[PDB]
Amino acid sequence: MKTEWPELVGKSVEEAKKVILQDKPEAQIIVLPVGTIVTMEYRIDRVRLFVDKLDNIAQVPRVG
Amino acid sequence: MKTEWPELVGKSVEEAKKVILQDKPEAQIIVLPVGTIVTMEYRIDRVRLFVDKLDNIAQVPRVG
Amino acid sequence: MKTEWPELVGKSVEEAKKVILQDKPEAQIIVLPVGTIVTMEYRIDRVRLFVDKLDNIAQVPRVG
Amino acid sequence: MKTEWPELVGKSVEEAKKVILQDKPEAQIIVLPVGTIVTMEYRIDRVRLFVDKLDNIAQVPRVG
Amino acid sequence: MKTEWPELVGKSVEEAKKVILQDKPEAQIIVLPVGTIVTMEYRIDRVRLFVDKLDNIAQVPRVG
Amino acid sequence: MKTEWPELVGKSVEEAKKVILQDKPEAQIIVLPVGTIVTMEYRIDRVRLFVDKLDNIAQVPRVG
Amino acid sequence: MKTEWPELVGKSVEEAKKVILQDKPEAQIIVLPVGTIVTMEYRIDRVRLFVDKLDNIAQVPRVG
Amino acid sequence: MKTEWPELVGKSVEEAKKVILQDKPEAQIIVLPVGTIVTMEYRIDRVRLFVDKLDNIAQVPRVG
Amino acid sequence: MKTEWPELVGKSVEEAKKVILQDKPEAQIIVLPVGTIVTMEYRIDRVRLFVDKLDNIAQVPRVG
Amino acid sequence: MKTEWPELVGKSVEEAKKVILQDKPEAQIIVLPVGTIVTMEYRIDRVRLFVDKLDNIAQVPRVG
Amino acid sequence: MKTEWPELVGKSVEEAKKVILQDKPEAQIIVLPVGTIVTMEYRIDRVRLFVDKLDNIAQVPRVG
Amino acid sequence: MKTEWPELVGKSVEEAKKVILQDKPEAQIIVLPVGTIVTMEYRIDRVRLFVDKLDNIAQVPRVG
């Protein structure tokens, strides 16, 4: 089961959403600034995007 | 008594407000960024929405 | 002496200011985001409003 | 020597600047959000204003 | 292998992106405010830019 | 070697940049909000400006 | 249903546990330092005690 | 698959470890203070215990 | 009504408790480290002591 | 090159040091509480252990 | 009026207290860990010592 | 002028103090936990050691 997208580091949100949804059609894509305090529970259909000032992906997206 | 809305993760605020108010007509819906420091007391009619950069629900809404 | 306004949770700032000033004409109404670090001294004429992303009251206003 | 302005709690920045400069013509008036982390040294000509979301004075201005 | 760009302190993002990509064509350039909490893993193709209020580079860019 | 500019407390960024560059032509001037977490290394050509909500200098600029 | 114990401010943990359990025999009593970051869910049988350096109750215990 | 232990709120670590390991023999039991900043990845064999000053469980243990 | 004890800055807790209770026999004296995050409500019988590493009073005790 | 030790989650520091040094004889093993703010540079011979209250490994050790 | 003691960086608390009290007999000497959040008012008779893990002075003591 | 000691990562404080003082006899050696908030000014004779739970050097000591 695809769980990480190292290939999207540096890409836009638009491009990240497109690639994740090809790979994971049920994905719930959440867009947060880098450094956001996240204590959440594990959601296997959620993919968090941690984004820089220009809304580019700053770290490896992972399911959860 | 309905207390959680896992079905609204990834949805907009507009859609979350609509579904919560169908389920809970007295709901006081509060919209906060993910990571917000919340020490509050329990309010049985309040539903907090924790939202990402695009105002989509990032976690499971719960009464309180 | 009126000290709390549980009835304003979920309401706008405009409506909160209107109701507080009917109840407390000397009120100094201060509008802060939820989660704001507040070490202040007690001011009996001040009412702090802790507001969400849409400027609705997220918690019970109290004098102080 | 005037050191505190409790009378400006709830007032605007414009009004606070006007009153402080009548009382203290050399004042260097600095406008910060409530909750700002301040480790500074003491400056006898500086007056910090701690302001809420609407740029009203949320606490008692003091020299320093 | 080029790993630091002390020459870009004080320069714009545009100029930093241009110089880094001449030196490192595979660079994934990420733009963050100074003071951002970064616990990340090491990515040898990523260059983080820590920027001030005017989007000028405030510290030495480094690979990672 | 000029290292501090107490005379710029309360002044604008424009005026601070002008005075610092007269005094220190190589200066790399960085503009940050008051309260910004700064763990940096010492750069003898850098001058950080810590600015309030109105982009006035809130503390004594120093080299580093 | 008893929900707050203002009478225990300043008292020890031992005394607080004794009084709470007389009033609320099912109580799960949790002892935390003042200032502890608490995002928890509401537990109607739990009573949190926020304690100072000497393990005296520093604020009003409340159910939750 | 057992995922939460609401029955251990208020109990000791010793008792929590005993009950969790009966229910989940592969459990890796980790003991942290309440309020600990946790950005971790999901580990299906790990159970975190969030403990108060007296090493009693302050919140519902959950797998992850 | 006595509300501040500037005379106890630098003194021990023992001495502070003794002087406060002479001045304010109903006082509930709470001992916290400097820098403790305090969002509390106003309690007119409580006196908080903010103490350094050696349990000496580091700031002016005040009622609240 | 071995870079992660998922097998040490839940184990002691003693056991973690032993296994890491078998796998990586040059390892510089650093022992930190979970939640420690780490902005460091990448050191290929360093292995950080993030430990719980009982000095057991709470997360997957990784080189860096 | 003596206001800073750069000569005490690296020295013990005992030695710092001795030198400060020779220079400033009214001094109220307060001993805090480095990194302590200090929003205080200016006290001209107080000297704060910011100390490392071994109770040595880590920064220049200053009046205030 | 020697400014960094990468060779002391993983070593004890005792050993770090010994090596630094051979290299830099005027050194003022300060011992802080990793993650300590440091806004200080530059002191060319000071060497800060950032130490883990076992008082081993966790990062590269540098002058400042």
Method: X-ray
Contact status, residue D48 vs residue D57, Cβ threshold 8 Å: no
Write phi, then psi, for H22 (nearest 5 degrees). Answer: -60, -45
Write phi, then psi, for E60 (nearest 5 degrees). Answer: -65, 115
Question: Token pair of C53, please?
Answer: 């992303």
The minimal CB distance from C51 to the residues D53, D56, D58 is found for D53
Chain C touches chain B, with at least 3 Cβ pairs below 8 Å, answer yes
Contact status, residue H2 vs residue H24, Cβ threshold 8 Å: yes
- B41 contacts in chain G (CB < 8 Å): 62, 64
Contact status, residue F28 vs residue E9, Cβ threshold 8 Å: yes
> What range does the domain containing L36 cover?
1-64
Please name which of A51, G31, H22, I10 lies closest in space to residue B53, comparing C-alpha atoms: A51
Terminal-to-terminal C-alpha distance of chain A: 13
Task: Tell me whether strands F62-63 and G28-33 are parallel, antiparallel or unpaired.
Answer: unpaired
Please name which of K33, K23, K21, K37 lies closest in space to residue K58, comparing C-alpha atoms: K33
The minimal CB distance from G37 to the residues B37, B62, B64 is found for B37
Write phi, then psi, for C35 (nearest 5 degrees). Answer: 90, -5
Instruction: Return d(Cα H50, Cα C43) in angstroms, integer.
Output: 37
Could you tell me where the DSSP H helices lie in C1-64? Answer: 13-23
The minimal CB distance from L34 to the residues J38, J51, J55 is found for J38
Torsion of CA E6, E12, E14, E15, to 10 degrees: -40
Write phi, then psi, for J26 (nearest 5 degrees). Answer: -90, 0
Contact status, residue E22 vs residue E39, Cβ threshold 8 Å: no
- J37 contacts in chain L (CB < 8 Å): 34-35
Q: Which amino acid is at G16?
A: A
Contact status, residue A50 vs residue A58, Cβ threshold 8 Å: yes
Q: How far is CA J15 from CA H58, J7, J12, J22, J23, in A?
A: 29, 11, 5, 11, 13
Question: What count of other Cβ atoms lies within 10 Å of the Cβ of residue E25?
Answer: 8
- The burial class, CB within 10 Å (0-12 / 13-18 / 19+), for J17 is middle
Q: Is H34 on the interface with J (CB under 8 A)?
A: no
User: Can you tell me which residue has the tokens 């007056």?
Assistant: D47
Q: Is C26 on the interface with I (CB under 8 A)?
A: no
Instruction: Return d(Cα E4, Cα E60) in angstroms, integer.
Output: 7
Cross-chain Cβ contact I39/C38 below 8 Å? yes
Is residue L15 classed as helix, strand or coil in its secondary structure?
helix
Q: How many structural domains comprise chain L? A: 1
Is residue B41 classed as helix, strand or coil in its secondary structure?
coil
Q: What angle do CA J3, J5, J9 make, to 5 degrees?
A: 150
Is residue F31 classed as helix, strand or coil in its secondary structure?
strand
Chain B touches chain E, with at least 3 Cβ pairs below 8 Å, answer no
Mutate to test the interface with I, among K24, K26, K30, K54 (most CBs of I within 10 A): K30
Question: Token pair of C39, please?
Answer: 């070490």
Chain A, residues 38-57, CB within 8 A of chain H, namely 38-39, 41-42
Q: Is D1 on the interface with K (CB under 8 A)?
A: no
Instruction: Return d(Cα F57, Cα G58) in angstroms, integer.
Output: 39
State the nearest Cα–Cα gap between F6 and chain D, in angstroms. Answer: 10
Query: In residues, how long is chain K?
Result: 64
User: DSSP secondary-structure letter at A51?
Assistant: E
Contact status, residue L60 vs residue L5, Cβ threshold 8 Å: yes
The minimal CB distance from D56 to the residues C30, C43, C45 is found for C30
The minimal CB distance from A64 to the residues H37, H41, H62 is found for H41
Write phi, then psi, for K55 (nearest 5 degrees). Answer: 60, 35
Contact status, residue C60 vs residue C20, Cβ threshold 8 Å: no
Instruction: Return d(Cα D61, Cα D5) in angstroms, integer.
Output: 5
User: DSSP secondary-structure letter at A59?
Assistant: S
- The burial class, CB within 10 Å (0-12 / 13-18 / 19+), for B12 is middle
Contact status, residue C45 vs residue C26, Cβ threshold 8 Å: yes
Contact status, residue B20 vs residue B5, Cβ threshold 8 Å: yes
Find all residues with CB under 8 Å of A34, minimum gap 6, and list them.
A50, A51, A52, A58, A59, E30, E32, E36, E37, E38
Question: Token pair of D50, please?
Answer: 């701690």
Edge-to-edge strands, sheet with F46-51:
F28-33, F46-51, F62-63
Question: Token pair of F26, please?
Answer: 């190589």
- C51 contacts in chain D (CB < 8 Å): 53
What resolution in angstrom units was achieved for this structure? 1.9
Contact status, residue B60 vs residue B9, Cβ threshold 8 Å: yes
The alpha carbon of K60 is separated from its chain's Cα centroid by a whole number of angstroms, namely 7
Q: How far is CA A59 from CA A12, A62, E29, E38, in A?
A: 12, 9, 11, 10
User: DSSP secondary-structure letter at K47?
Assistant: E
Cross-chain Cβ contact C39/I38 below 8 Å? yes
Cross-chain Cβ contact K34/L29 below 8 Å? no
Terminal-to-terminal C-alpha distance of chain K: 13
Find all residues with CB under 8 Å of F24, minimum gap 6, and list them.
F2, F45, F47, F63
Cross-chain Cβ contact G42/B37 below 8 Å? no
Half-sphere exposure of K29 (CA within 13 A, CB side): 21
Q: What angle do CA F7, F13, F18 make, to 5 degrees?
A: 70
Instruction: Return d(Cα A62, Cα A59) in angstroms, integer.
Output: 9
Three-state SS string over chain G comes to CCCECHHHCCCEHHHHHHHHHHHCCCCEEEEEECCCCCCCCCCCCEEEEEECCCCEECCCCEEC
- B58 contacts in chain A (CB < 8 Å): 30, 32, 40, 48
Q: How many helices (H) and strands (E) does chain K have?
A: 1, 3
Instruction: Return d(Cα H50, Cα K54) in angstroms, integer.
Output: 30
Query: In residues, how long is chain J?
Result: 64
Chains meeting H at 3+ CB pairs closer than 8 A? A, G, J
- K43 — alpha (psi -120 to 50), left (phi > 0) or beta? beta
Contact status, residue I7 vs residue I20, Cβ threshold 8 Å: no
Q: Is the dihedral of CA F39, F41, F42, F44 positive or negative?
A: negative
Could you tell me where the DSSP H helices lie in chain H? Answer: 13-23
Contact status, residue G18 vs residue G35, Cβ threshold 8 Å: no
User: DSSP secondary-structure letter at I6?
Assistant: G
Half-sphere exposure of K34 (CA within 13 A, CB side): 26
Task: Tell me whether strands K46-51 and K28-33 are parallel, antiparallel or unpaired.
Answer: parallel
Instruction: Return d(Cα J41, Cα J39) in angstroms, integer.
Output: 7
Find all residues with CB under 8 Å of D51, minimum gap 6, and list them.
D13, D31, D32, D33, D34, D57, D58, F53
Question: Token pair of E17, please?
Answer: 């992106």
Contact status, residue B21 vs residue B2, Cβ threshold 8 Å: no
Find all residues with CB under 8 Å of E12, minimum gap 6, and list them.
E55, E56, E57
Question: Token pair of F62, please?
Answer: 């120093």
Q: Which amino acid is at E43?
A: R
State the nearest Cα–Cα gap between G61 and chain B, in angstroms. Answer: 12
- H58 — alpha (psi -120 to 50), left (phi > 0) or beta? alpha
Q: How far is CA F24 from CA A48, F15, F27, in A?
A: 45, 14, 6
Instruction: Return d(Cα D56, Cα D30) in angstroms, integer.
Output: 13
Cross-chain Cβ contact H32/J56 below 8 Å? no
